[PDB]
Design a protein around this motif. Structure first.
Motif, mmCIF file in Angstrom:
data_model
loop_
_atom_site.group_PDB
_atom_site.id
_atom_site.type_symbol
_atom_site.label_atom_id
_atom_site.label_comp_id
_atom_site.label_asym_id
_atom_site.label_seq_id
_atom_site.Cartn_x
_atom_site.Cartn_y
_atom_site.Cartn_z
ATOM 1 N N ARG A 1 -11.250 -29.488 8.555
ATOM 2 C CA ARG A 1 -10.920 -28.157 7.983
ATOM 3 C C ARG A 1 -9.808 -27.492 8.761
ATOM 4 O O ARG A 1 -8.813 -26.991 8.158
ATOM 5 C CB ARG A 1 -12.266 -27.355 8.011
ATOM 6 N N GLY A 2 -9.921 -27.451 10.063
ATOM 7 C CA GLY A 2 -8.938 -26.861 10.995
ATOM 8 C C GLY A 2 -8.379 -25.544 10.544
ATOM 9 O O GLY A 2 -9.145 -24.568 10.275
ATOM 10 N N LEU A 3 -7.056 -25.441 10.418
ATOM 11 C CA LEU A 3 -6.379 -24.264 9.923
ATOM 12 C C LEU A 3 -5.822 -24.457 8.504
ATOM 13 O O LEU A 3 -5.048 -23.628 8.067
ATOM 14 C CB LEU A 3 -5.367 -23.705 10.881
ATOM 15 N N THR A 4 -6.235 -25.526 7.881
ATOM 16 C CA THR A 4 -5.751 -25.849 6.517
ATOM 17 C C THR A 4 -6.595 -25.454 5.374
ATOM 18 O O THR A 4 -6.066 -25.631 4.239
ATOM 19 C CB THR A 4 -5.278 -27.389 6.474
ATOM 20 N N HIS A 5 -7.758 -24.869 5.519
ATOM 21 C CA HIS A 5 -8.575 -24.417 4.400
ATOM 22 C C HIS A 5 -7.892 -23.507 3.434
ATOM 23 O O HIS A 5 -8.073 -23.666 2.202
ATOM 24 C CB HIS A 5 -9.960 -23.891 4.796
ATOM 25 N N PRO A 6 -7.197 -22.459 3.869
ATOM 26 C CA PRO A 6 -6.504 -21.522 3.038
ATOM 27 C C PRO A 6 -5.510 -22.239 2.100
ATOM 28 O O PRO A 6 -5.398 -21.718 0.985
ATOM 29 C CB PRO A 6 -5.805 -20.513 3.987
ATOM 30 N N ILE A 7 -4.824 -23.235 2.609
ATOM 31 C CA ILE A 7 -3.848 -23.965 1.723
ATOM 32 C C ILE A 7 -4.551 -24.775 0.624
ATOM 33 O O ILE A 7 -4.192 -24.639 -0.555
ATOM 34 C CB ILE A 7 -2.997 -24.902 2.661
ATOM 35 N N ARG A 8 -5.548 -25.551 1.037
ATOM 36 C CA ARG A 8 -6.386 -26.305 0.090
ATOM 37 C C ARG A 8 -6.958 -25.364 -0.947
ATOM 38 O O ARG A 8 -6.853 -25.678 -2.149
ATOM 39 C CB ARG A 8 -7.509 -27.081 0.807
ATOM 40 N N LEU A 9 -7.526 -24.216 -0.553
ATOM 41 C CA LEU A 9 -8.059 -23.252 -1.507
ATOM 42 C C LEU A 9 -7.005 -22.724 -2.475
ATOM 43 O O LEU A 9 -7.314 -22.586 -3.701
ATOM 44 C CB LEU A 9 -8.849 -22.112 -0.811
ATOM 45 N N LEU A 10 -5.845 -22.445 -1.967
ATOM 46 C CA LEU A 10 -4.709 -21.882 -2.690
ATOM 47 C C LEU A 10 -4.130 -22.904 -3.686
ATOM 48 O O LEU A 10 -3.757 -22.442 -4.790
ATOM 49 C CB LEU A 10 -3.626 -21.388 -1.738
ATOM 50 N N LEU A 11 -3.982 -24.112 -3.220
ATOM 51 C CA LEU A 11 -3.508 -25.175 -4.175
ATOM 52 C C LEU A 11 -4.477 -25.241 -5.359
ATOM 53 O O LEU A 11 -4.013 -25.373 -6.518
ATOM 54 C CB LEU A 11 -3.369 -26.473 -3.396
ATOM 55 N N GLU A 12 -5.749 -25.147 -5.106
ATOM 56 C CA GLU A 12 -6.810 -25.201 -6.132
ATOM 57 C C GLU A 12 -6.835 -24.012 -7.028
ATOM 58 O O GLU A 12 -6.947 -24.124 -8.271
ATOM 59 C CB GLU A 12 -8.192 -25.444 -5.499
ATOM 60 N N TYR A 13 -6.791 -22.798 -6.480
ATOM 61 C CA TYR A 13 -6.741 -21.544 -7.191
ATOM 62 C C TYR A 13 -5.559 -21.408 -8.168
ATOM 63 O O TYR A 13 -5.758 -20.807 -9.255
ATOM 64 C CB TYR A 13 -6.677 -20.359 -6.200
ATOM 65 N N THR A 14 -4.426 -21.947 -7.831
ATOM 66 C CA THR A 14 -3.213 -21.839 -8.629
ATOM 67 C C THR A 14 -3.016 -23.027 -9.583
ATOM 68 O O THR A 14 -1.950 -23.147 -10.198
ATOM 69 C CB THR A 14 -1.955 -21.637 -7.691
ATOM 70 N N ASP A 15 -4.018 -23.837 -9.662
ATOM 71 C CA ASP A 15 -4.068 -25.080 -10.422
ATOM 72 C C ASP A 15 -2.895 -25.993 -10.149
ATOM 73 O O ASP A 15 -2.394 -26.610 -11.136
ATOM 74 C CB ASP A 15 -4.233 -24.794 -11.922
ATOM 75 N N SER A 16 -2.444 -26.116 -8.941
ATOM 76 C CA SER A 16 -1.295 -26.943 -8.543
ATOM 77 C C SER A 16 -1.649 -28.419 -8.604
ATOM 78 O O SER A 16 -2.799 -28.791 -8.319
ATOM 79 C CB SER A 16 -0.884 -26.621 -7.094
ATOM 80 N N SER A 17 -0.667 -29.240 -8.967
ATOM 81 C CA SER A 17 -0.840 -30.687 -9.006
ATOM 82 C C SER A 17 -0.445 -31.144 -7.584
ATOM 83 O O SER A 17 0.707 -30.964 -7.238
ATOM 84 C CB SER A 17 0.092 -31.416 -9.987
ATOM 85 N N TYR A 18 -1.431 -31.678 -6.879
ATOM 86 C CA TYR A 18 -1.157 -32.090 -5.510
ATOM 87 C C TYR A 18 -2.065 -33.219 -5.105
ATOM 88 O O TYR A 18 -3.168 -33.400 -5.630
ATOM 89 C CB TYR A 18 -1.379 -30.851 -4.541
ATOM 90 N N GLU A 19 -1.504 -34.005 -4.206
ATOM 91 C CA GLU A 19 -2.243 -35.091 -3.588
ATOM 92 C C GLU A 19 -2.297 -34.759 -2.094
ATOM 93 O O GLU A 19 -1.358 -34.146 -1.614
ATOM 94 C CB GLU A 19 -1.639 -36.458 -3.725
ATOM 95 N N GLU A 20 -3.310 -35.263 -1.432
ATOM 96 C CA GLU A 20 -3.435 -35.029 -0.015
ATOM 97 C C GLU A 20 -3.414 -36.327 0.751
ATOM 98 O O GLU A 20 -3.943 -37.356 0.299
ATOM 99 C CB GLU A 20 -4.767 -34.376 0.422
ATOM 100 N N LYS A 21 -2.900 -36.163 1.945
ATOM 101 C CA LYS A 21 -2.877 -37.173 2.966
ATOM 102 C C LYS A 21 -3.685 -36.611 4.148
ATOM 103 O O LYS A 21 -3.204 -35.642 4.771
ATOM 104 C CB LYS A 21 -1.481 -37.544 3.443
ATOM 105 N N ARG A 22 -4.874 -37.128 4.290
ATOM 106 C CA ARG A 22 -5.807 -36.709 5.345
ATOM 107 C C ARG A 22 -5.823 -37.741 6.463
ATOM 108 O O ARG A 22 -6.542 -38.763 6.350
ATOM 109 C CB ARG A 22 -7.214 -36.464 4.789
#
Ligand SMILES: N[C@@H](CCC(=O)N[C@@H](CS[C@@H]1c2ccccc2-c2ccccc2[C@H]1O)C(=O)NCC(=O)O)C(=O)O
Ligand SMILES: N[C@@H](CCC(=O)N[C@@H](CS[C@@H]1c2ccccc2-c2ccccc2[C@H]1O)C(=O)NCC(=O)O)C(=O)O
Lengths: 217, 217
Positions: free
Chosen positions: B10-31
């Motif tokens: 989770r670290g400091l990246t939760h807000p971005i993950r939430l935001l990508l989801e909220y705005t219905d953005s098409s995105y892939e992640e590299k974890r």
């Protein structure tokens, strides 16, 4: 006038003090003094921390009429919006956002090292990471006169301060990067800046509090 | 799609993950994964760190076509401007600027403790300070539904995250603050958020890397 509150050290407030000058802002400062060891009294501030009507009491603070701001970055941005020193295109906005945050990162690095009891042990090692840091700023800036593009923006005051600090820390760090030395000269050459630097208000050093291992006096 | 890269925490990246989801953005992640102690191998990341065309290589990163961004707060801002989730008036901008930076301060305090090898002995001292921190957020929000005003803004993504982290750390920390529990529920209550939380993608904990003294596995 506006009021700027901070310790009587350069700390992380240089950019705001320079920006107040550059914009010809009517301001007065409250420079709180910390006590000497062993105590290092913070009383001068502490007595009024929760009496100023700040939302999240901190140093630095800025009082501008009925607006009360804390968080150095929020103070910079507030002043930038006020005086039209923001990026004008998406491209400039992005550059400015990244720069603002990267500076804070490079600042925390210096701070964290400067407050380590093991400072002398650590120096050598931190010194080896400078070139890589400076390289990144040099390549980012490139041939541009300012960090965001064609005009001076609030981020140039943030970058000036950090490059200047690193330069004080290691005199030869910018020798391999002429564009950055050029940038320092160009920033220092801005009329209000040049005047400020010769004035009684100029506070170049110390950078840190009594407590640090470097630039503490 | 847009590419978000970060550790598999989770670290400091939760807000971005939430935001990508909220705005219905098409995105892939590299974890990226980190090895276990004692080496804590970082090769997955380091193998490509200098190979992605980032100006100042770091995690998190966001690649949006030709646009390559680092610094978590610049990523939030970029996504906010794209989707009109910025403050609309001066007052909202200032509230946002302050909360953004305050969140980072409160995040760094938590990190400092969690990475302290004296964690268990240090913890008691830390706990004593929470009530004050929560109180400031509580008084700042007041009766507003959201941090900037009457509309969700990107800063509510940051505030949500730091409030949730502290609540996980000390589950009784919001009991004294009705409006803060209300805020968490309101935010979790948002359709897109509620949906994400049930998804395969959701990564609530661990918060920290394997190197930490708490929430590390
Ligand atoms: N993130 C906040 C910084 C808040 C903060 O840490 N303020 C310190 C001064 S900066 C502080 C500092 C102090 C003395 C000397 C140097 C510094 C400094 C320099 C560089 C980077 C960071 C610092 C901080 O340690 C403080 O004394 N706050 C009032 C309080 O807590 O009651 C901001 O950007 O404005
Ligand atoms: N200021 C930068 C944070 C920079 C940073 O420290 N990045 C870390 C991850 S956040 C890191 C972290 C890692 C794991 C778990 C938690 C955290 C975390 C949590 C909160 C706050 C800060 C951190 C960082 O220590 C990283 O690994 N950078 C790549 C590199 O150096 O090559 C930003 O806001 O994006």
């Amino acid at each position: 006038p506006m009021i700027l509150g901070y310790w009587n050290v350069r700390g992380l407030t240089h950019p705001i003090r320079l920006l107040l000058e550059y914009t010809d802002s009517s301001y007065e400062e409250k420079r709180y003094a910390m006590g000497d060891a062993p105590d290092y009294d913070r009383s001068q501030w502490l007595n009024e921390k929760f009496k100023l009507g700040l939302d999240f009491p901190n140093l630095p603070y800025l009082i501008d009429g009925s607006r009360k701001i804390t968080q150095s970055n929020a103070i910079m941005r507030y002043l930038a919006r006020k005086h039209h020193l923001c990026g004008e295109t998406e491209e400039e906005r992005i550059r400015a956002d990244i720069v603002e945050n990267q500076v804070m990162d490079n600042r925390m690095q210096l701070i964290m090292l400067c407050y380590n009891p093991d400072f002398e042990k650590q120096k050598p090692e931190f010194l080896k990471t400078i070139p890589e840091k400076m390289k990144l700023y040099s390549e980012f800036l490139g041939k541009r006169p300012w960090f965001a593009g064609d005009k001076v923006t609030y981020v140039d005051f943030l970058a000036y301060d950090i490059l200047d600090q690193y330069h004080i820390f290691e005199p030869k760090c910018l020798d391999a990067f002429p564009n950055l030395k050029d940038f320092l000269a160009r920033f220092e050459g801005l009329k209000k800046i040049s005047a400020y630097m010769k004035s009684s208000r100029y506070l170049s050093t110390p950078i840190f509090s009594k407590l640090a291992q470097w630039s503490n006096k």
